[PDB]
Each structure stands twice: as C-alpha cells, then as structure tokens.
UniProtKB/Swiss-Prot annotation, chain B:
Induction: By TGFB1.
Protein name, UniProt field: Ryanodine receptor 2
Involvement in disorder: Ventricular tachycardia, catecholaminergic polymorphic, 1, with or without atrial dysfunction and/or dilated cardiomyopathy: An arrhythmogenic disorder characterized by stress-induced, bidirectional ventricular tachycardia that may degenerate into cardiac arrest and cause sudden death. Patients present with recurrent syncope, seizures, or sudden death after physical activity or emotional stress. CPVT1 inheritance is autosomal dominant.
Post-translational changes noted in the entry: Channel activity is modulated by phosphorylation. Phosphorylation is increased in failing heart, leading to calcium leaks and increased cytoplasmic Ca(2+) levels.
Function per UniProt: Cytosolic calcium-activated calcium channel that mediates the release of Ca(2+) from the sarcoplasmic reticulum into the cytosol and thereby plays a key role in triggering cardiac muscle contraction. Aberrant channel activation can lead to cardiac arrhythmia. In cardiac myocytes, calcium release is triggered by increased Ca(2+) cytosolic levels due to activation of the L-type calcium channel CACNA1C. The calcium channel activity is modulated by formation of heterotetramers with RYR3. Required for cellular calcium ion homeostasis. Required for embryonic heart development.
Subunit annotation: Homotetramer. Can also form heterotetramers with RYR1 and RYR3. Interacts with FKBP1A and FKBP1B; these interactions may stabilize the channel in its closed state and prevent Ca(2+) leaks. Interacts with CALM and S100A1; these interactions regulate channel activity. Identified in a complex composed of RYR2, FKBP1B, PKA catalytic subunit, PRKAR2A, AKAP6, and the protein phosphatases PP2A and PP1. Interacts directly with FKBP1B, PKA, PP1 and PP2A. Interacts with SELENON. In cardiac muscles, identified in a complex, composed of FSD2, CMYA5 and RYR2.
Residues of the full protein shown: 1930 to 2010 of 4967
Family classification: Belongs to the ryanodine receptor (TC 1.A.3.1) family. RYR2 subfamily.
Length: 67, 81
C-alpha cells in the first residue's frame, strides 16, 4: 500500500492534467448519461404533411419528409 | 479550470485531516485512503459521481452545487430543459 500512497493524488498533478481528467470524467458520468425523449415528437413532425392544399401541385400529395 | 482547482484543494484538505485521523482510527483509515490509492482517473470518476442521489461520493455540498448549476446552464445552452 506504500506504493499506492506514493502515487500522486489529483492535488499533486499539474492543473492541465487534472483538467483533462475532469473533462473525460465529466463526459462519461454526465453527458452520456443525460438522456431526453424527443423521438415521438420528431417523427410526428416529420410525418405531418405541410400545407398540401396550399401548395399548388395540382396532383397527388407530395411525399412527407419522413417518406 | 476553477472547478478542478477547488476540487484539488479540498482533496488536499480531506487528505490532511484523514492523515491526522489515522492515528485515532486504523481500520477505517484504510477504507478512507482507498480513494487516494485508486488511480487518478478512478478518483475523478468517483468525485464526479455525485450525480443522482446515491450519495457515496466524498465531494462537498458547495462544490457539488457549483457543478450542478454549471451543468444546468450547459443544458440550457444545448436547448434541452
């Protein structure tokens, strides 16, 4: 355990190395774990036809963005 | 920059008073210094693990709240509230 004690904790390390370690740890622990639900809203918005009668196509409706 | 600066200072302070307390407690101080024995990546992982409410991290309250506020600001900037 003596070698483990001798191994430098974060306070001994220079500031830039600690900053990089914090960046990686923050990424892993927070940014990846942060999850939100938007798929249903996005799919519905893409599926909704946009002003087909106002659009002067004079034919079959244009394929929706999801299509 | 500033967050890790204060985190390193508080780790220094905790290391110091644990170093004082090992004399009173020999069995507990080993479990406490497992934190310092672990590699720096693992140390910063558990220091940042104060997300959610498992409350096993040694990070103090003001330091935790600072990162929570900055994360909220970053989420607002990203547009996900």
């Amino acid at each position: 355990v003596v070698a483990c004690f001798r191994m430098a904790p974060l306070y001994n390390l220079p500031r830039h190395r600690a900053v990089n370690l914090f960046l990686q740890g923050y990424e892993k622990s927070w940014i990846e774990t942060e999850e939100h639900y938007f798929e249903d809203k996005l799919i519905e918005d893409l599926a909704k036809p946009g002003a087909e009668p106002p659009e002067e196509d004079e034919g079959t409706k244009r394929v929706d963005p999801l299509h | 920059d500033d967050f890790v600066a204060k985190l390193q200072d508080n780790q220094r302070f905790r290391y110091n008073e644990v170093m004082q307390a090992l004399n009173m407690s020999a069995a507990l101080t080993a479990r406490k210094t497992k934190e310092f024995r672990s590699p720096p990546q693992e140390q910063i992982n558990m220091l940042l693990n104060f997300k959610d409410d498992k409350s096993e991290c040694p990070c103090p309250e003001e330091i935790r709240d600072q990162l929570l506020d900055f994360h909220e600001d970053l989420m607002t900037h990203c547009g996900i509230e």
